[PDB]
């Protein structure tokens with residue numbers, strides 16, 4: 001779809017059986033979700049943002065549906081305020097920025 | 100133009116007679132730039148990011164040229180580690196997201 005930026009570019013995602021909403025975020029290199037149960041192994045990671053750093057745990061090879069689109073990648077689950085889909089996944093759903 | 104998201108979407112801006120690069124950021128509601136000299140007065144505010152919150156200075160009615168397009172808006176200046184152009188200016192230059 002084409003999305004204009006008058007409102008937050010929010011989308012529905014399905015991850016691990018659960019349905020969420022998440023912000024499409026061109027400025028994020030990574031995807032990070034608030035705490036949710038994911039199965040599997042994970043490794044700790046830390047990421048920086050405005051504000052400072054958070055400790056996060058990294059899951060790889062996670063399937064996500066974003067709108068209908070499926071993709072698989074790394075998701076970081078952590079204490080973010082908002083669930084962010086970052087460039088790692090945006091490339092897979094073919095997302096483009098246009099002006 | 101069209102920007103894909105395989106690399107970070109940076110653009111040149113001209114702000115306060117100075118030339119900078121910044122990140123086109125659909126997830127950000129506000130424009131936040133690193134410390135620099137803008138003329139004029141400003142109010143303090145704080146903003147939340149990941150990792151927490153920072154205090155910034157709000158300037159209103161500032162001219163910025165983003166990739167050659169001019170815009171006027173609120174810019175926040177403060178301790179970000181990267182310059183971020185958020186939805187308040189992205190909207191003025193007609194930026195769309197699409198997939």
Ligand SMILES: Nc1cccc(CN2C(=O)N(Cc3cccc(N)c3)[C@H](Cc3ccccc3)[C@H](O)[C@@H](O)[C@H]2Cc2ccccc2)c1
Nearest residue numbers: 027028029030048049050081084126127128129147148149
């Ligand atoms: N790797 C990574 C993954 C996910 C998020 C971030 C860190 N980010 C933020 O903290 N933001 C707060 C931010 C940035 C600018 C303005 C505002 N209002 C908020 C928002 C996302 C956001 C988080 C929490 C609440 C709302 C939005 C912005 O939209 C994101 O692109 C980046 C901006 C950024 C900051 C530092 C370094 C690189 C990129 C980093």
